[PDB]
């Protein structure tokens, strides 16, 4: 149903965290996840005032917005990262220079 679809979307956006590992690989998505959770808490309490506890709360908007904004940051990072990887695959580095500012190797 349309309502069901909406609810599903909402679930996805809140549950990104559980639904699929992004956080594993980049653990600042954790902030985003937290924000989403907070929104859910707020939104659900607003939405289920006189109405009781259960699934079927739509109103995915703020969560969606949050995810969009998160994606903004990634765009850049991914373009450096993924792009770099593809470059490597086509043309794979010549003479890298290690860096002694590392704790290891300094001494």
């Amino acid at each position: 149903d349309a309502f069901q679809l909406a609810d599903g979307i909402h679930y996805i956006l809140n549950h990104i965290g559980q639904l699929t590992g992004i956080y594993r690989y980049k653990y600042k998505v954790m902030h985003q996840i937290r924000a989403c959770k907070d929104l859910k808490h707020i939104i659900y309490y607003k939405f289920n005032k006189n109405l009781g506890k259960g699934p079927g709360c739509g109103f995915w908007q703020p969560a969606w917005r949050v995810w969009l904004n998160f994606l903004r940051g990634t765009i850049p990072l991914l373009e450096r990262y993924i792009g770099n990887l593809i470059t490597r695959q086509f043309e794979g580095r010549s003479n890298e220079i290690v860096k002694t500012t590392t704790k290891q190797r300094l001494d």
Partner: protein
Amino acid sequence: YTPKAEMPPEHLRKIINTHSDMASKMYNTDKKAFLGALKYLPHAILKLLENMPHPWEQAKEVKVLYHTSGAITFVNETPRVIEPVYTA
């Protein structure tokens, strides 16, 4: 200069379908293109997500750019609204 040709969606669909079972020396370059496209796949994702049809909408038509190789497809339009109306 002169704007982009509004292509038919049919063409796009056909292109997409062709690059499913892609394993000939034909489209060697298309594979390369696809590989390259990872660069912009997150951008594409962001776009598509942004255009998500809202629950007051059965199905949104949306502007689309796509590499003629079939490697990547960006939803092009950026969805703006009359704020109060949107809120309502």
